[PDB]
Amino acid sequence: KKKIFKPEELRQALMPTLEALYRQDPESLPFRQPVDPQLLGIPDYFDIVKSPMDLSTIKRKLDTGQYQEPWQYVDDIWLMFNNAWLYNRKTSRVYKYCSKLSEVFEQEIDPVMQSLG
Ligand SMILES: COc1ccc(N2C(=O)CCC[C@H]2c2nc(-c3ccc4onc(C)c4c3)cn2C[C@H](C)N2CCOCC2)cc1Cl
């Protein structure tokens, strides 16, 4: 159902789910900044991931009120996870850290979504 949200109320409801990802150490560390394929020596990264997303991009979008609806925020979190599972091998540390972050997110986001509508 349609609902108009104030960015300030989105920010205050959704920020805590984002801060819960940030406090996962070491599991959030790969996700805190945009993937720099050159710095990381993964030059195939942009062949595989066409919509990169990371926690700092998501935090900037919350702080500039670029999310109109909660589901847009969730879509960016899920894009970030999907990108990491897609690029990384099932056996790799970043894949497992991604899986850990998605479990934390799933537990944090369920009640916040209920409370927004
Ligand atoms: C604490 O965890 C790590 C420490 C180093 C590394 N790294 C490596 O093992 C070798 C490459 C440099 C570093 C590193 N890799 C990646 C990496 C790689 C592939 C990826 O696909 N999708 C994503 C997101 C992604 C990220 C990131 N990094 C930097 C590493 C996490 N830093 C460690 C602590 O300071 C800030 C970040 C990875 C992790 Cl999980």
Swiss-Prot record:
**PTMs?**
Acetylated on Lys at up to 17 positions by intermolecular autocatalysis. Sumoylated; sumoylation in the transcriptional repression domain (CRD1) mediates transcriptional repression. Desumoylated by SENP3 through the removal of SUMO2 and SUMO3.
Q: Where does this protein reside within or beyond the cell?
A: Cytoplasm; Nucleus; Chromosome
| Domain Bromo span(s) in chain numbering | 5-112
**Disease implicated:** Defects in EP300 may play a role in epithelial cancer.
Its function?
A: Functions as a histone acetyltransferase and regulates transcription via chromatin remodeling. Acetylates all four core histones in nucleosomes. Histone acetylation gives an epigenetic tag for transcriptional activation. Mediates acetylation of histone H3 at 'Lys-122' (H3K122ac), a modification that localizes at the surface of the histone octamer and stimulates transcription, possibly by promoting nucleosome instability. Mediates acetylation of histone H3 at 'Lys-18' and 'Lys-27' (H3K18ac and H3K27ac, respectively). (Microbial infection) In case of HIV-1 infection, it is recruited by the viral protein Tat. Regulates Tat's transactivating activity and may help inducing chromatin remodeling of proviral genes. Binds to and may be involved in the transforming capacity of the adenovirus E1A protein.
Q: What is known of its domains?
A: The CRD1 domain (cell cycle regulatory domain 1) mediates transcriptional repression of a subset of p300 responsive genes; it can be de-repressed by CDKN1A/p21WAF1 at least at some promoters. It contains sumoylation and acetylation sites and the same lysine residues may be targeted for the respective modifications. It is proposed that deacetylation by SIRT1 allows sumoylation leading to suppressed activity.
Q: Could you describe the subunit structure of this protein?
A: Interacts with HIF1A; the interaction is stimulated in response to hypoxia and inhibited by CITED2. Probably part of a complex with HIF1A and CREBBP. Interacts (via N-terminus) with TFAP2A (via N-terminus); the interaction requires CITED2. Interacts (via CH1 domain) with CITED2 (via C-terminus). Interacts with CITED1 (unphosphorylated form preferentially and via C-terminus). Interacts with ESR1; the interaction is estrogen-dependent and enhanced by CITED1. Interacts with HIPK2.
Protein name in UniProt: Histone acetyltransferase p300
Segment of the intact protein contained: 1045 to 1161 of 2414
